[PDB]
């Protein structure tokens, strides 16, 4: 889905 | 040994035209292996004549970054706030409560990242869909690098927000970055617009094992419930305990107007000395087709970056496709070797 910071 | 030190590189004009290309080189002459390398631009090149009319930008999903821990070791975790603009942000980031202590030098600085990265919970702007550069910014766009890894979009059609399109992160003093490897192991670049400097850790990917080794000492639970849990983005590890257990590592600070490159497999972390904005995205080169097939994937949450490898095994390892279909691909990585592309200047 996306790059996230978590 | 300086091989796998963090190296600083100064192209010319002429040079910083290609991007991928001096990628190739600067591998060529080593930087990978230390996981994280620094490219000054030349000082004709700006990418936004202001940036006072980014105002009216909006941070859509702000996180606070709690953090529990001790001796070295350490949890973050993240909490979604209400979306602000940046004016807002600026201002709780040079605000007295949240803004830079004072300081004589980095390692003090360092000191006291450590010393209270738990009290005082600050505000990461992270993750923001967008970009600073100009339209007609040809050079080293981070929306536009024009690297194998379009492959995802132009071929297989498919948009991964952060990996093959731009990110934004307005930082404050301590907000942090946890240990990582990028999603698939690929690399990354990270230009630092404006604003306080950004401080980096990294390892050697000759040595990311180690790395997981130990981390998976410290988190038995968390290795249990994951086959590659530090993509969670939220184990912090200072340098001490590093040294402490022999794991290799460099540092390095990013200042205004500078690029990082982080390479296949290098795992990194670090935290923003004051207010500041950099973007962000991922890329590729042909050695990291690889990487990107041997990678550990996170396996217990849902919405994680995969890529589909097929594409790129087909196209550039069509020797193997059949192979690496059956599962019988047993290509052993060799991390000190440089990309395929850096033959020209070896
Ligand atoms: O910008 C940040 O907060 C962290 N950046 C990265 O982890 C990267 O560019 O690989
Ligand atoms: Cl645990
Ligand atoms: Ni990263
Ligand atoms: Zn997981």
Same mark, same amino acid.
């Given at each position: 889905?996306?790059?996230?910071?978590? | 040994?300086?091989?796998?030190?963090?190296?600083?590189?100064?192209?010319?004009?002429?040079?910083?035209?290609?991007?991928?290309?001096?990628?190739?080189?600067?591998?060529?002459? $080593?930087? #990978?292996?230390?996981?994280?390398?620094?490219?000054?631009?030349?000082?004709?090149?700006?990418?936004?004549?202001?940036?006072?009319?980014?105002?009216? *930008?909006?941070?859509?999903?702000?996180?606070?970054?709690?953090?529990?821990?001790?001796?070295? *070791?350490?949890?973050?975790?993240?909490?979604?706030?209400?979306?602000?603009?940046?004016?807002?942000?600026?201002?709780?980031?040079?605000?007295?409560?949240?803004?830079?202590?004072?300081?004589?030098?980095?390692?003090?600085?360092?000191?006291?990242?450590?010393?209270?990265?738990?009290?005082?919970?600050?505000?990461?702007?992270?993750?923001?869909?967008?970009?600073?550069?100009?339209?007609?910014?040809?050079?080293?766009?981070?929306?536009?690098?024009?690297?194998?890894?379009?492959? &995802?979009?132009?071929?297989?059609?498919?948009?991964?927000?952060? &990996?093959?399109?731009?990110?934004?992160?307005?930082?404050?003093?301590?907000?942090?970055?946890?240990?990582?490897?990028?999603?698939?192991?690929?690399?990354?670049?990270?230009?630092?617009?404006?604003?306080?400097?950004?401080?980096?850790?990294?390892?050697?990917?000759? #040595?990311?094992?180690?790395?997981?080794?130990?981390?998976?000492?410290?988190?038995?639970?968390?290795?249990?419930?994951?086959?590659?849990? *530090?993509?969670?983005?939220?184990?912090?590890?200072?340098?001490?305990?590093?040294?402490?257990? $022999?794991?290799?590592?460099?540092?390095?600070?990013?200042?205004?107007?500078?690029?990082?490159?982080?390479?296949?497999?290098?795992?990194?972390?670090?935290?923003?000395?004051?207010?500041?904005?950099?973007?962000?995205?991922?890329?590729?080169?042909?050695?990291?087709?690889?990487?990107?097939?041997?990678?550990?994937?996170?396996?217990?949450?849902?919405?994680?970056?995969?890529?589909?490898?097929?594409?790129?095994?087909?196209?550039?390892?069509?020797?193997?496709?059949?192979?690496?279909?059956?599962?019988?691909?047993?290509?052993?990585?060799?991390?000190?070797?440089?990309?395929?592309?850096?033959?020209?200047?070896?």
């Amino acid at each position: 889905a996306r790059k996230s910071a978590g | 040994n300086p091989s796998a030190r963090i190296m600083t590189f100064y192209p010319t004009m002429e040079e910083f035209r290609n991007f991928s290309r001096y990628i190739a080189y600067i591998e060529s002459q $080593g930087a #990978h292996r230390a996981g994280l390398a620094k490219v000054v631009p030349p000082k004709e090149w700006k990418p936004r004549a202001s940036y006072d009319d980014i105002d009216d *930008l909006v941070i859509p999903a702000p996180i606070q970054q709690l953090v529990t821990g001790q001796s070295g *070791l350490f949890t973050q975790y993240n909490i979604q706030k209400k979306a602000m603009t940046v004016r807002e942000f600026r201002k709780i980031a040079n605000s007295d409560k949240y803004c830079t202590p004072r300081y004589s030098e980095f390692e003090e600085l360092e000191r006291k990242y450590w010393k209270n990265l738990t009290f005082n919970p600050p505000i990461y702007g992270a993750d923001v869909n967008g970009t600073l550069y100009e339209k007609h910014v040809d050079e080293w766009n981070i929306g536009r690098l024009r690297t194998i890894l379009d492959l &995802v979009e132009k071929e297989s059609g498919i948009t991964i927000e952060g &990996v093959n399109t731009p990110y934004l992160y307005f930082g404050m003093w301590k907000t942090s970055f946890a240990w990582h490897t990028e999603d698939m192991d690929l690399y990354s670049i990270n230009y630092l617009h404006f604003g306080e400097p950004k401080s980096w850790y990294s390892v050697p990917p000759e #040595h990311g094992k180690r790395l997981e080794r130990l981390a998976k000492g410290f988190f038995p639970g968390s290795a249990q419930s994951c086959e590659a849990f *530090l993509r969670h983005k939220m184990t912090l590890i200072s340098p001490l305990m590093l040294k402490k257990y $022999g794991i290799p590592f460099d540092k390095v600070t990013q200042e205004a107007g500078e690029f990082m490159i982080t390479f296949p497999y290098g795992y990194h972390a670090g935290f923003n000395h004051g207010f500041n904005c950099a973007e962000s995205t991922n890329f590729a080169t042909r050695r990291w087709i690889e990487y990107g097939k041997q990678a550990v994937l996170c396996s217990c949450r849902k919405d994680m970056v995969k890529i589909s490898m097929d594409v790129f095994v087909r196209k550039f390892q069509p020797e193997r496709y059949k192979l690496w279909k059956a599962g019988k691909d047993n290509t052993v990585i060799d991390h000190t070797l440089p990309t395929p592309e850096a033959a020209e200047f070896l």
